[PDB]
Design a protein around this nucleic acid. Sequence first.
DNA 1: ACTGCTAGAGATTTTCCAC
DNA 2: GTGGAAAATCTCTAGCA
DNA 3: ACTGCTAGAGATTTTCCAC
DNA 4: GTGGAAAATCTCTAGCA
Lengths: 61, 61, 261, 239, 261, 239, 47, 47
Amino acid sequence: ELQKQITKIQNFRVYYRDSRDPVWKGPAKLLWKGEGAVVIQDNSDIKVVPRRKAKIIRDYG
Amino acid sequence: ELQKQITKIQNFRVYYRDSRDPVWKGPAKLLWKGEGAVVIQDNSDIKVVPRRKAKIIRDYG
Amino acid sequence: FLDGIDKAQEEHEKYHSNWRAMASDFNLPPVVAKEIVASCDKCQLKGEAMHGQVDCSPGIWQLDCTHLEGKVILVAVHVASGYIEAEVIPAETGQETAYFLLKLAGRWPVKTVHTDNGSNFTSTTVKAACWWAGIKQEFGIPYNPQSQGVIESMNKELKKIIGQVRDQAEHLKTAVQMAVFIHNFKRKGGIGGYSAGERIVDIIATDIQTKELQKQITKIQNFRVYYRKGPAKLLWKGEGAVVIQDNSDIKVVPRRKAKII
Amino acid sequence: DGIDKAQEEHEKYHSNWRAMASDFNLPPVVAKEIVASCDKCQSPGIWQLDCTHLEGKVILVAVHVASGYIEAEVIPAETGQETAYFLLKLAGRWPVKTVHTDNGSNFTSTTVKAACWWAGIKQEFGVIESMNKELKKIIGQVRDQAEHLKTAVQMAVFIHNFKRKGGIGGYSAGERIVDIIATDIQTKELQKQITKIQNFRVYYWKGPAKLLWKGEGAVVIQDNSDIKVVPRRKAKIIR
Amino acid sequence: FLDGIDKAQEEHEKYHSNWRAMASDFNLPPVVAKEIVASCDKCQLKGEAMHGQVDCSPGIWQLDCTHLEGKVILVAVHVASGYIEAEVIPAETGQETAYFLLKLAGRWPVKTVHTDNGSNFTSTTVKAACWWAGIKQEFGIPYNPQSQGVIESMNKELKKIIGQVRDQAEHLKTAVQMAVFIHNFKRKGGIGGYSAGERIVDIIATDIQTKELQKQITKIQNFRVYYRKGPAKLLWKGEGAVVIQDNSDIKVVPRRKAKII
Amino acid sequence: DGIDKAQEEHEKYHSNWRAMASDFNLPPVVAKEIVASCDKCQSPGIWQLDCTHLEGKVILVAVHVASGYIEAEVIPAETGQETAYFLLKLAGRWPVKTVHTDNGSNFTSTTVKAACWWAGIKQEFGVIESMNKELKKIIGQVRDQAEHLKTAVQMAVFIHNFKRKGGIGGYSAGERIVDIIATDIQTKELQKQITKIQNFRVYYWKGPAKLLWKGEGAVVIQDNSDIKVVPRRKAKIIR
Amino acid sequence: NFRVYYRDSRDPVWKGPAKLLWKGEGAVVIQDNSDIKVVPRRKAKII
Amino acid sequence: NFRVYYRDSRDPVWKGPAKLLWKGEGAVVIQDNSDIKVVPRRKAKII
DNA sequence: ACTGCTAGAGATTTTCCAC
DNA sequence: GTGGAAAATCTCTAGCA
DNA sequence: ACTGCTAGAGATTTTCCAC
DNA sequence: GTGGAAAATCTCTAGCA
Ligand SMILES: C[C@@H]1CCO[C@H]2Cn3cc(C(=O)NCc4ccc(F)cc4F)c(=O)c(O)c3C(=O)N12
Ligand SMILES: C[C@@H]1CCO[C@H]2Cn3cc(C(=O)NCc4ccc(F)cc4F)c(=O)c(O)c3C(=O)N12
Ligand SMILES: [Mg+2]
Ligand SMILES: [Mg+2]
Ligand SMILES: [Mg+2]
Ligand SMILES: [Mg+2]
Ligand SMILES: [Zn+2]
Ligand SMILES: [Zn+2]
């Protein structure tokens, strides 16, 4: 049911940057993807990254 | 006798850089000055800095 | 030190001393010296020491024109993946760029193109081509190549590869295509240890799949969450936190002080 | 842990490894080995090239038969060099491994052979004809919107690839080709993993067992068509 | 993977793939892929990402020629302190530079001059002037401005200051002298919060005083220290450590395992 | 802590503040106040300019009277503009505060007045003559080594400043001027410190006492010509 | 209100003061005598 | 023994291999076909 | 109301494998 | 629990012209 | 065998002053 | 022992052309 889809979305990985740091942050875990923002979880921390600062991939590793 | 001169020499301050770090290290304490190397004490640590990497000033502060 | 203020103001009008010099030579507090410096129009000669960040959405391509051996190479790069396409065009004209853009939009889902203010990119032909294909046009601040950094970087990379394979082709067009092939499918590294082609396929497929899954979830999962406000749509929950959106303002609140109906 | 349920499900229904891995949370190598353990369980990079004519101009068309994705270009003349250039452009954009051609003089030129050799493409001498008919129909539809034929052809390619939908899932050719290439990438990563682990022998003394998965605190192995799990401490792995 | 080595070698000879691509597409260990890449002459196109450090001894000056409003400005900087002297010279000639160098050596203790390979600096006239004044000449690696970074930086700074005071003079020479004055005695900062003139005076005075004091100490204090070696002349002791100089190799040893006679 | 010994030493010998600070390890402000507390105890930026003539050429000479450091330059003519340019060069190189001139027409020009006003120099209208004679002697000695007179003048300046030693300590003019300017910098830093602390009033209640030193864990103050030390906790400092 | 001093288009001379209309990450939109400009923050100073 | 590939004088083309004669901090002295060159380490690669 | 980045060469920190 | 070694992560620079 | 650096604009960490 | 605030230290970039 809904849980399988939530877990599937959760399986994707997100690389993101903060508003001043130019280095790309590690492979966070996607939780929500929206039209303008993506809600991710990086090291037990939830963040709301603008869509323009996110690269979302299901790494085929 | 000799101790007054040693203390006078020790009053001088030395700014130095390491062989790869481009940032100048803080005001170390001079211990010996030679033709080619300067022996300094920076945070209870004795170092032998090449003369070309040292700025020795008696800060008039 | 009030008289020091006037003395330092005259001293600065003459010599334009920095705040340290005025503070030391007039016993001014650092705030007053900095104010004296900041009131001088002639001493405002340095900008902020930072760099911005370009857009890296899945649908943004950065285009540029580079030159090599007297030829013009039009290069497009997918910002999110590093995937490049390059064509040797006869001249930097609006017609050639519009043709290149229509080709590019026919192969991959181009939503916006970011370019410098070169005459070819600003021509009405490229505007018409983008309008027909539904592409949004972004222009960087004039004479600010950093705004196009990505594509600029790729120029370098592209030329490098050409330098390694120019001896394997009789013409520059073939060498350019060889370089594009090598960059897209023979250079691995980056976010996922990927090639550029693998990375772009992953990016596009992930976009499609996440859109589909999120559409289904929002269709199925329906809740309203109150915290601390109005009818804030529920977005996600778990690990002792609830992420919600209220008036289109996404926020994260602790599981406590939050009720879901 | 959940290997036995997956094996029983495979025996009942003969399901593929993607389904088993998704359902039973197994590493894909284990599911692939489960599928390969049954004796009764035993394209993405293939392109078809043709050159049509329209308004006395030559249109070279490449079709991804697995998806219907189209790449069309108006070329000056049916020349070997130009076909080679088009093929090199195509190979630099998509992972082309095989190309089918109609034995035409341009397609059999030494230049095209050299281009395919450099790009690592194998050459073999009615999807293409139907796709050409559809492309010509779209070109006729949009010809009022373009002064030249090359622009009309590119507009037709765009419309066909992205603004036309159909099939079982109502997808466009672009989505289908992206999905097919993604599946191919997954398959090749899995094959690389299998090749990486196929040169290990594990003793758990029990006979020399093949290695299927080395986890954080477990070692999943196969012996005589029986899949087992053993502790990392109890297992010894060699080349 | 032994056959993979040959397959990857052919693949690299064709496409020049990086070690990641070869390792991924041929199951090669990273060492072998890196070896394959490192054996290709065409793939050696990048140097190490590091910067050297220029000499900063008290007696080294860096000289350069900059241009402004069609005029030639010869600028010298004391590397240790940032103290500058600039003169507008009629032309980039050897005679003018030799005159400037003799003037500079007559005011301050110039022991070394470090310069680019410009024609004026490499002229026999400057060589004769340096020989007479006992100055050693150092030339940076050709077309490597970073070797003269300090003076290059000062050029920037100097011009900046001129931009702030050019309206206060009817000639560029006067503006240059105003800029030199402002830099030397109206801009404070750096290691000691000093200005350039104060810093150079401090550097030179400290050099003289430390030389004198160390001469006295050495004439007075005589000891020989054995550690672990030979008769290593004692240099300093205290805080549980002894600094010694054995065979002109200064070293620091713990107070233990060291005996002084 | 060592203030009383320093005060007694000053009473017996009337020593300066540098000596007391060095000997008794006091902060310089305390020693300066000790010196200023007694009644019985109550130049580095002064230059002399002249224009000599040699071989029908004008040589402008500046002498640091406190040290004998020389700066000479052959100028085209005794003009106000040339003198102003020389003065600006000199002021940009050394901390010039006052200049003594011989009432010559060039030295009294409005251009020189403007240059001195911009550089913050005060103008006043036998060290210079003796130094000119010495410079002419050195120029005569070295004239065989220079084709032109300007080069000979610069060589003479170099020899006089650095290759001639004498006096009580056997020092050169360069060393002497560097030492004098360093002492001037020390004096100005001390004056800045005194100015900074002179606008505090400290209560330790005991009357309003001036502040002399605010140490890490002590406050040294003066009251009615008696220097005392208090802990920071007992002392209250206000502007 | 703010004062912006900027260097806009391959012109080493700095200009200003100008009124700050909008501040973003990496660029600022300013008004300089009825003229609107967009300047990267590297080339602008705001007081 | 080492192989040095270098870019010497405002010439974007890299050269090499060459024999490393001396390695210092920030520069290396190399020999390339009876020709001695001094190259900053930013413009040299040593294997 | 827009925005530096990419990939390679060392160096340093992490993890893995047997003892 | 721990050395060696291999792998992963971090730091830094040139060129884009 | 020789070698990037300087100074200013923000930002972040430290120390000091009274409570 | 602790907030505010001021001061010190750290990070980073343009221009030298
Ligand atoms: C005539 C068009 C329109 C108006 O602007 C000019 C000049 N220009 C200049 C550079 C350039 O300066 N590249 C070097 C560079 C420097 C810094 C950086 F971050 C990135 C970089 F690429 C370009 O790349 C470029 O494409 C152009 C260009 O196209 N035009
Ligand atoms: C004809 C002489 C002799 C042969 O070399 C040329 C060319 N050159 C070029 C620059 C230069 O590129 N400056 C910009 C720059 C770039 C990077 C950096 F780190 C420092 C910098 F200053 C100079 O400054 C310079 O003085 C010269 C020069 O004098 N010459
Ligand atoms: Mg461009
Ligand atoms: Mg460009
Ligand atoms: Mg130069
Ligand atoms: Mg220069
Ligand atoms: Zn100012
Ligand atoms: Zn290669």
